[PDB]
Design a protein around this ligand. Structure first.
Ligand SMILES: *NS(=O)(=O)OC[C@H]1C[C@@H](Nc2ccnc3cc(-c4cccc(SC(F)(F)F)c4)nn23)[C@H](O)[C@@H]1O
Ligand SMILES: [Cl-]
Ligand SMILES: [Cl-]
Lengths: 76, 1006
């Protein structure tokens, strides 16, 4: 299936995945596309931050779901 | 066409000159000056629009003070508009603020480009005003807050052009091939970073010449390293070279009217976990108005059941009339609507701040076409903020007005909870942008105004002019004073309940101030809130919060982007548990020899600046005042030869007047932009080839060309002026009654009489090509014998330059800009202006008040959760925003990782072993085996090993009988300072089966 990853700068990434896939996996597909190491990636979906152990099923991620890749900022 | 950079500097890096120029031709009208209206207005006036006009002829009442920080009790009975006007005016001298007396004549709306309708304006009147606006090209925005709920609606008309959807730097990149079908391959491993449907232009593409003419090409992304632009065989055939630059094209969009949208709304979601709620609230908000029509302007009574059921029924009727909002077979969420009724009169600071920031930014979008507007409705709630009714019962008695400014907060949370807020003890780290907003919010909460409460705020910085653009507590007359102190005073004028309750300190947090910010200070607090501008500080506060077990409310911004995080004792990860992307380093060879971007020439120039005017001076002063210096340098410097040449040159040259400084700077121009370039070219001529026979100067290596000084060139001229002026300052030489602007003809007569020595190559010099390949005593002895004896120069001092990005008269950015651009000319890189150079060299963070208030609002809604000591992680919200998009999303915090040793479960972040007193080593080891089932294997204080189970008997007899303080003295040869009240010890240990197991750390309480 396809899912979408929207970044905090408005970029849209498309991914080919399976709900059996791990978050670890998804992070590495994101690494392939954007060059961002997995340990720097914050993915959120439907009120939860996705964690390394789990699967796409564990967060209930359907086809054409959008996940958000977000950041923390240093200004203040 | 003129923008005050000294005021607007940081906002300008967010919005841009064009957007701000349109903003300054836009007249804005705000209807309603309760909290929401005044928050929106504050932000828009700070941002700088041609004029702000406010309308609100209703008398001030005590309850209006819940969120309207510019009303005082003395204002009661007078009109909101009139009383607020002057205080908004003081925020920005460039923006007049007027009061519209009467809006009986809707025709008056024609004077304005953007009209905003807040919570004070009826729905019936909103639809009328919107129809007037929409049909005559006036941009319309509305917003309403009701308790912990809120919305906003945007209608920019039938024709609106978005000029830039995101505000991001255009992508850019180097190209290595373009095939006939249009497939564009990036150079090496560089990522183009484009998205399908982006547009790009090209330059330097050899063999396709009309492809460089400015034509745009639509992008088809193939992978991370290639995109396609459509056939190019009609333009020629690619040879080499090429740089693509992304272009944002304009986009025309249409809005519907408020009326059309009431029954077919287009939603943007505030939180995707809550999406099924937007339609329901959309019904509910309309119902509050129907309700008011039937009850003579009045909203539902606070916590009242009869009225809530009336609202539930009004909503039910509405879903029949607007079948399209819920859709087919979706029931009215009755509990939601009941809460909306219950809270309809609530005026909550955090929610007002959230909408005030958001809606202010939509106003700026509407004036400018910068950023993507909200299209068209957004609804929001923060219901998770409600305390557990077990601890704080909510009902008609507890929530009733008490005749105080807090009555409409009480309306939601109840009196006892509001009193608990007043008795909180809080530390605020920072009094800048977040800091000022935070203290305003706290003033409105009455936080710390109870006899058991207080606020401490610390910040060592003083108020600079650009601060005034987003630190709304400061005035032009406060410039130079201390932020924390002025801020504290300002918020007491806003709410006198805090008079005497804010301790404003001028200390920086960190390891050096732990005597001030000590055990007793920290243990006394309920929680800590950050308001900081860098990561190391946030990390330090996070560590202390872990150690003292205090919650921490974290936030941050960068332009339109922002985030919130909560760190809760014994529940979540801490700030330092996770990593953020680090700043990418430029390779050394790229800076030194092969720059291809202005970022590179700026870094180079900044460093030359340091060396010329700061480092070389500091060195000379050390050498003249430290009789061991030369000996000290030899053993300990990495670069010895450099330090000694910099002293030698600083003392032989020794100018006597300004004319000599001109000469030094001209010769520096020749060395840096002529000779060094000819040298690099001696080692690698234009046509030179690599090992495989490919051209050396390709891709990132751009073949330079030496400069012939030309005083009519701005960069050449300013290099000399700024370089001479700074040299002069180093040597204490008066600049030319320097109030005088520098004169071209004057400098030219000096430069024209100079003999500029010719370049001679050096065949010894080898230049480092890649960073991997390594490269660079009797000249040193020679260089020492050349140095003047220090008693030759008695009382001679050089004055080092302390870099200051924000003084336009001091020559610093003048120099770096000119020095950068001269090297840019060398390498055919586009030169940059002072603003851009200042942004890069000065590491300036883009910043605006809208994002700052919104994010602060979000923090103050998590704050409510701490007051209730919530232990259910599912209740807390880390937030992420970009107002440019606009985007809001939230996530439940991550749990602290847990461990186990033996049968004991522990928190890997938060748990420790607390030991009372200066315990003896043997007693400690024994306590752990007897009480914890742990055989200590290794025990350490910082860097130093105090005990290890492999220690043989002689060594153990030395240590086992020592208290920990003495054990440290034995090992580190160093005392424990008097003031130190705790010591952290790390341990490794084996469990009851003799296996190594990860365990908590130990705190020794002395
Ligand atoms: N975003 S803003 O408008 O620029 O305002 C930000 C505030 C925060 C201030 N900085 C500040 C205030 C109080 N204490 C500290 C400590 C530090 C700091 C900075 C760098 C390194 C270190 S040492 C370490 F990491 F703690 F070990 C400490 N910054 N503090 C500004 O003054 C501004 O007003
Ligand atoms: Cl109303
Ligand atoms: Cl921009």
């Amino acid at each position: 299936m396809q899912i979408f990853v929207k970044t905090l700068t408005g970029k849209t990434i498309t991914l080919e995945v399976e709900s059996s896939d791990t978050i670890d996996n998804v992070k590495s597909k994101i690494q392939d596309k954007e060059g961002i190491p997995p340990d720097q990636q914050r993915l959120i979906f439907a009120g939860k931050q996705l964690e390394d152990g789990r699967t796409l099923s564990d967060y209930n991620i359907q086809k054409e779901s959008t996940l958000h890749l977000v950041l923390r900022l240093r200004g203040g | 066409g003129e923008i005050d950079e000294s005021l607007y500097s940081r906002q300008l890096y967010v919005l841009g000159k064009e957007a701000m120029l349109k903003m300054q031709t836009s007249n804005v009208l705000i209807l309603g000056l309760k909290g929401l209206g005044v928050e929106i207005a504050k932000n828009v006036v700070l941002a700088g629009v041609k004029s702000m006009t406010v309308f609100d002829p209703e008398p001030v009442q005590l309850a209006d003070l819940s969120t309207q920080f510019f009303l005082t009790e003395k204002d009661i009975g007078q009109k909101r508009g009139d009383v607020t006007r002057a205080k908004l005016a003081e925020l920005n001298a460039y923006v007049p603020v007027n009061v519209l007396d009467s809006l009986d004549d809707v025709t008056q709306l024609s004077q304005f480009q953007v009209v905003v309708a807040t919570d004070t304006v009826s729905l019936e009147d909103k639809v009328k005003i919107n129809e007037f606006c929409h049909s005559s090209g006036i941009r319309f925005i509305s917003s309403e807050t009701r308790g912990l709920f809120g919305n906003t609606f945007v209608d920019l008309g039938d024709e609106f052009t978005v000029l830039d959807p995101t505000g991001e730097e255009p992508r850019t990149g180097m190209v290595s091939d373009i095939e006939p079908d249009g497939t564009v391959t990036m150079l090496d491993d560089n990522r183009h970073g484009l998205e399908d449907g982006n547009f790009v232009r090209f330059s330097e593409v050899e063999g396709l010449d009309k492809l460089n003419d400015g034509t745009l090409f639509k992008v088809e992304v193939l992978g991370p390293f290639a995109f396609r632009i459509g056939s190019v065989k009609e333009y020629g055939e690619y040879k080499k070279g090429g740089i693509f630059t992304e272009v944002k094209v304009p986009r025309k969009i249409s809005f519907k009217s408020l009326k059309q949208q009431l029954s077919n709304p287009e939603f943007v979601f505030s939180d995707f976990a809550k999406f099924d709620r937007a339609a329901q609230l959309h019904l509910g908000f309309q119902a509050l108005h129907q309700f008011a029509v039937r009850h003579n302007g009045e909203l539902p009574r606070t916590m009242n059941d009869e009225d809530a059921n009336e609202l539930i029924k009004l909503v039910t009727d509405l879903s029949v009339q607007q079948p399209e909002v819920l859709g087919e077979g979706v029931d009215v969420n009755e509990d939601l609507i009941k809460e909306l009724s219950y809270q309809a009169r609530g005026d909550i600071p955090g929610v007002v701040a959230f909408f005030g920031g958001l809606v202010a930014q939509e106003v700026l979008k509407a004036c400018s076409g910068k950023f993507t507007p909200l299209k068209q409705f957004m609804y929001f709630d923060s219901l998770e903020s409600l305390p557990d009714p077990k601890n704080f019962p909510r009902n008609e008695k507890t929530t009733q007005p008490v005749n105080s400014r807090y009555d409409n907060q009480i309306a939601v949370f109840g009196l006892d909870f509001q009193k608990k807020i007043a008795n909180s003890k809080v530390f605020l780290v920072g009094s800048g942008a977040i800091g000022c907003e935070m203290l305003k919010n706290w003033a409105l909460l009455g936080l710390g105004s109870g006899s058991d409460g207080y606020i401490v705020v610390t910040d060592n910085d003083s108020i600079e002019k650009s601060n005034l653009n987003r630190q709304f507590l400061f005035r032009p007359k406060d410039v130079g004073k201390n932020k924390s102190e002025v801020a504290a005073e300002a918020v007491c004028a806003m709410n006198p309940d805090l008079k005497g309750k804010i301790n404003a300190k001028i200390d920086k947090v960190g390891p050096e101030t732990e005597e001030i910010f000590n055990d007793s200070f920290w243990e006394s607090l309920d929680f800590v809130t950050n308001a900081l501008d860098n990561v190391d500080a946030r990390t330090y506060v996070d560590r202390r919060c872990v150690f003292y077990r205090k919650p921490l409310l974290e936030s941050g911004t960068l332009g339109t982007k922002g985030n919130t995080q909560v760190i809760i004792p014994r529940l979540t990860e801490s700030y330092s548990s996770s990593r953020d992307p680090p700043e990418k380093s430029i390779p050394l060879c790229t800076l030194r020899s092969f720059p291809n971007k202005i970022d590179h020439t700026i870094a180079w120039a900044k460093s030359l600046f340091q060396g010329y005017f700061t480092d070389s001076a500091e060195n000379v002063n050390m050498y003249l005042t430290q009789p061991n210096f030369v000996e000290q340098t030899l053993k300990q410097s990495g670069d010895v030869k450099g330090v000694l040449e910099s002293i030698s040159d600083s003392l032989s040259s020794k100018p006597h007047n300004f004319e000599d400084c001109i000469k030094w700077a001209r010769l520096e121009f020749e060395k840096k932009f002529n000779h060094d370039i000819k040298q690099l070219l001696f080692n690698f001529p234009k046509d030179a080839k690599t090992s495989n026979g490919e051209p050396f100067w390709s891709g990132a290596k751009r073949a330079p060309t030496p400069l012939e000084f030309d005083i009519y060139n701005n960069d050449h001229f300013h290099f000399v002026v700024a370089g001479a002026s700074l040299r002069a300052y180093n040597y204490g030489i008066k600049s030319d009654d320097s109030n005088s602007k520098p004169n071209v003809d004057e400098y030219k007569s000096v430069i024209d009489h100079m003999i500029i020595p010719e370049f001679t190559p050096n065949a010894n010099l080898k230049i480092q090509v890649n960073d991997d390949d390594p490269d660079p005593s009797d000249e040193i002895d020679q260089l020492v014998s050349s140095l003047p004896d220090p008693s030759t120069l008695a009382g001679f001092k050089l004055e080092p330059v302390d870099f200051e990005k924000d003084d336009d008269t001091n020559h610093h950015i003048e120099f770096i800009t000119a020095c950068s651009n001269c090297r840019a000319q060398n390498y055919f890189i586009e030169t940059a202006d002072r603003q851009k150079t200042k942004f890069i060299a000065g590491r300036i963070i883009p910043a605006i008040a809208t994002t700052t208030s919104l994010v602060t609002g979000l923090v103050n809604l998590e704050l409510y959760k701490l007051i209730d000591n919530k232990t259910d992680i599912e209740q807390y919200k880390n937030g992420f925003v970009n107002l440019a998009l606009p985007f809001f999303g939230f996530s439940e915090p991550i749990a602290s990782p847990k461990g186990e040793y033996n049968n004991k479960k522990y928190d890997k972040i938060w748990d420790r072993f607390d030991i009372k007193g200066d315990i003896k080593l043997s007693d400690l080891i024994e306590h752990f085996e007897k009480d914890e089932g742990l055989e200590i294997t290794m025990l350490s204080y910082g860097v130093s090993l105090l005990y290890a189970s492999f220690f043989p008997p002689k060594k153990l007899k030395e240590r086992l009988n020592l208290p920990i303080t003495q054990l440290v003295k034995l090992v580190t040869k160093k005392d424990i300072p008097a003031h130190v009240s705790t010591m952290i010890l790390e341990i490794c240990a084996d469990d009851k089966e003799g296996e190594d197991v990860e365990v908590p750390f130990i705190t020794i309480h002395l």
